[PDB]
From Swiss-Prot, chain A:
The record marks 65, 68, 71, 96, 107, 185 as: RNA-binding. Encapsidates the genomic RNA, protecting it from nucleases. Displays high affinity for single-stranded nucleic acid. The encapsidated genomic RNA is termed the nucleocapsid (NC) or ribonucleoprotein. The ribonucleoprotein has a non-helical structure. Serves as template for viral transcription and replication. After replication, the nucleocapsid is recruited to the host Golgi apparatus by glycoprotein Gn for packaging into virus particles. Keywords: Capsid protein, Host cytoplasm, Host Golgi apparatus, Host nucleus, Ribonucleoprotein, RNA-binding, Viral nucleoprotein, Virion. It comes from Dabie bandavirus. This is Nucleoprotein.
Amino acid sequence: AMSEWSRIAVEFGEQQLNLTELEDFARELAYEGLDPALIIKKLKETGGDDWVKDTKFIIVFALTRGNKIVKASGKMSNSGSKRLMALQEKYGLVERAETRLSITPVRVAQSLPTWTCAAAAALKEYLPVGPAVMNLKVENYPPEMMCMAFGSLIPTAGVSEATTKTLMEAYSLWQDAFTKTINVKMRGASKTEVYNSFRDPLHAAVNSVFFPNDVRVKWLKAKGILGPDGVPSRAAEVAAAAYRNL
Amino acid sequence: MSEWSRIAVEFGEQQLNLTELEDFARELAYEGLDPALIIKKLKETGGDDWVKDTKFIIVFALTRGNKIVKASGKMSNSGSKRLMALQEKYGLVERAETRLSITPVRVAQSLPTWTCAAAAALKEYLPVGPAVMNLKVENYPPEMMCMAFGSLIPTAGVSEATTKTLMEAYSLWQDAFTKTINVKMRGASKTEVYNSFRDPLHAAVNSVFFPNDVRVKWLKAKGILGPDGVPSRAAEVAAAAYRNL
Amino acid sequence: MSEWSRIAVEFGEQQLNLTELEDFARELAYEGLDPALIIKKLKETGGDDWVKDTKFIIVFALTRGNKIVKASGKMSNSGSKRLMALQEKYGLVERAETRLSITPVRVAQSLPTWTCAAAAALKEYLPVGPAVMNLKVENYPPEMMCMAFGSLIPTAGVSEATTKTLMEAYSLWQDAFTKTINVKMRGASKTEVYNSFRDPLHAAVNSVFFPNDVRVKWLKAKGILGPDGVPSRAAEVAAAAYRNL
Amino acid sequence: MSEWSRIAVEFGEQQLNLTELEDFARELAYEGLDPALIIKKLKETGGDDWVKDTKFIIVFALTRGNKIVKASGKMSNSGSKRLMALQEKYGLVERAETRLSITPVRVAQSLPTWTCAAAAALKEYLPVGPAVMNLKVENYPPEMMCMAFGSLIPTAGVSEATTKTLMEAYSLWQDAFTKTINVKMRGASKTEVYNSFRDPLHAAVNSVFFPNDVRVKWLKAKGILGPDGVPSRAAEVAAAAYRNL
Amino acid sequence: MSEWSRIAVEFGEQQLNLTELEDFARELAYEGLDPALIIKKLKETGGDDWVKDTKFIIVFALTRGNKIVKASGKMSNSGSKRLMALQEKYGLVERAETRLSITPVRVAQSLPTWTCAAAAALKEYLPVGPAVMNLKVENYPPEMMCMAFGSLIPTAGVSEATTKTLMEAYSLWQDAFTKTINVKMRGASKTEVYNSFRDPLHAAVNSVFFPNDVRVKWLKAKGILGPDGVPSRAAEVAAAAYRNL
């Protein structure tokens, strides 16, 4: 009212919302941890042959050591150090995901989710936070869930909303545990504060559409995490309950 | 007494000038932003694309905040490209250092009634949404879930009791926003957290730019103030929640 | 036994010169500011805009502190322009590093009786005012709601308990100030907080720059002392309140 | 339903090569140091002084750790000179960043039977020695009070319960060391403490450089294992005492 | 077994030279200062201003510590100007980097008996004076309220149990000083801060520079030890106080 600027503010408020375009903007700008297609393309293009061989290796590193290439290269066998650093030069691996284009080894593992989670369980005895830590909270925690990549495999279609919620709570057990075990800064945070530090990445993975739900459900059934009826395992239901109970 | 000592004393014998001083106080009192300068800049720069460009900036502020570069690595390709472009185009910055610093949130703050309505329509997208609020109160007004709602609390055409409830109701989200989003506030009391936002909120409320005669109408239309001029039920329960830690 | 050990042994054998020592201690003691240094600089640099300039600088100190650049980003453009102008005009700084360092607050401290009177006149604009204070005690004396008040407590013309009591009342505000305003010292003990301000508070009180015959007269004329030279009701309560954690 | 999506899927559809994988995991597994790399550098560079030089470094590592420069300003003048000489002479560094980095503590780890032997002799000089271990357990084996003892725990020629006990006894010191010395670990949980050394411990216990037959025969000679091949009273009680938080 | 592996094996089958090792350990153990060095530097550099110069330096150390520049900006002009001159004059540093670092406190520690006397005479000027210790203990010995006291604690000329009482009585001031002055030390257990001073204290007490016979005689001349060579009432009380957390 008072100035032309004041009136402009008021009239801008008088407008009517376009709910279809506001939504688009919202999703356009919504959190996103990675573009799996860009990482797979970068990888396959860069290494022609020897890209499946080279990628897997990057995934075992991510699974067992994280993103910290340089510190890690100094604390490993010579051949593993040698190859790791070779692959870093070769793919331009970075230790921190600054932009959409930055290839961290954990982004690599998150981009091939069903291979990673399978490798996780085969290697459960090498994971930084595996059966030891998990088993003393629940009997038989599904080892495929012991990695950053498992959230991409929780489905949102072909299962009940309750099933999807169970899988997230169960998975949160390991998320919360990994964080505490691994993150120095996070030590002493309430259960909610731990949660928030991973709310967004887990959501973006779940509600992502790159890895198709029908493939998820089948994988889940095949691993026993869902029964044939499409509802969680015993172990999942407990892990979920455990997590709801702190 | 040295010559100086004697000056110091004679300086406190002077009569106070209560208008001089008040004027001084207000001129130096914390000020959140110049919305006028912000709107003028966006319009003069954008031409007519400014109205859409703004809405797009406001949605960014609503769901991502101010950290443009960090957030551009964590979105879609369309979002990121458009956002970087709007930044280059308008001179957008991530920190509100000076009065001329155009931050996404300050843009949101300079078009209040749109932002809140957008926030409510985009409520499921907010970093502190109904997921958070509901654990504290059933039916938290979604128009209160954003940084811009502060400008809409009126101080004229409602009682200072109505005003105060709207601010306590609002302080519930201010609290949860801070505690949820920024690490430097872990294990901090309800009086420390309030203090981290005392200054901006009191300045938002007592801003003269966005007029109170519209604030009351808009609140009414949005059911946060009833027709009798008093808060809704959802507000009163929200105030009560905050009053009780 | 040889021969530096001998020098050491023989060194400790000497008789102390208690005066030598006590003078060394006074020279090396904490000192917060040379008020005369301050006032002299202001009066030489600014001519007579100096009396106006100081008030306005003091109001800045009383309501926003020492943070010249951050504050100026967050205030009316009028206030912002005169602040940066006065900074350059007087070489105002943000941190006291040397005795030469002229900060707003030190300026505030160099004209005590004016500062506390304006603190009183502008209670509602203080970052720690009657709001925070009434949650502690009924009627907390407003003149004590600033950094300047310490300089006004008497070490002569009153009983030593009177002095102890004024300082105990004051530490209510001091403690409140720090906790409310220091980002560090958040989960910190009472004495820990007290230790953050003992040395300056003690230095301020024991200062010889501002005469006690004026302090007592002013304190009585403000009612913080009664005519018999003893604390008021609300001062006695404030001490006990500080005493009682 | 995308080119790249279809790639991810059939990718995750591959059979694992459990041997491919086991090998990658081991290659990428945490490795504390390459003792063979270490010995070979000390012996190529040291010629024959190497033995007596190594002994001196191992002694500094045992009693001051790895912080060469800071420690040299706080010791005797001769020991300080000899420190800095051996540093230039062998490229001794303070942090183990690469596999090539030669730290005193690493040097010590590369010769664990000597190191643990000489640690028991130097028990009164150890940062964490018999005073701390006696407030926890009767008769803590002195050979254990060092970073090198982990390598001496065997996985071959003893029961796998023997091994667990030996790791549990040892963790008592390990836990005490980190709490005593690491300013960060202060006020952390027992688990939080165990994690910071779980990895290097398992790598040491599981290394193949220093042979299990020799580890066992040595521990027999030191009575950390009785003739049967099972723990000592002290190991057993020390084990139990670590277990009980 | 093979092949560098075999070197590490035979390296550990080498007999221990306990003469070699004990020497190494002493050369390498913690040392706080060559006080002879310090006195030597001061006498040669200063001729006879040297005696009065040191006295002044020590008063500085006692009441303000080692931070020359920071403190010189918060004292009288007189004291600031003399302090800086002495720093240029003597090459004074604020931090104890190497054995040649002559810090104020290090000067105080080089002339222990003088310092503790000076400390007791200036007890009210000390950063941790009676105000602190008087709450903890009735009549805490003022000579112990400084860093130099530990060199005075005797190891010979008195019983082992007497010594432990002094080290314990003293630690009460040690504990108090560290907690009350170092912020990084806040929120920390008793053992965490004891460790903070354990090495320096041990190094002082066990030093051979200052002869034990003087220590005892001097302790006696102050009533810290009675004529039979035993701790005072104040001594045993303060020790009890310290063992009782």
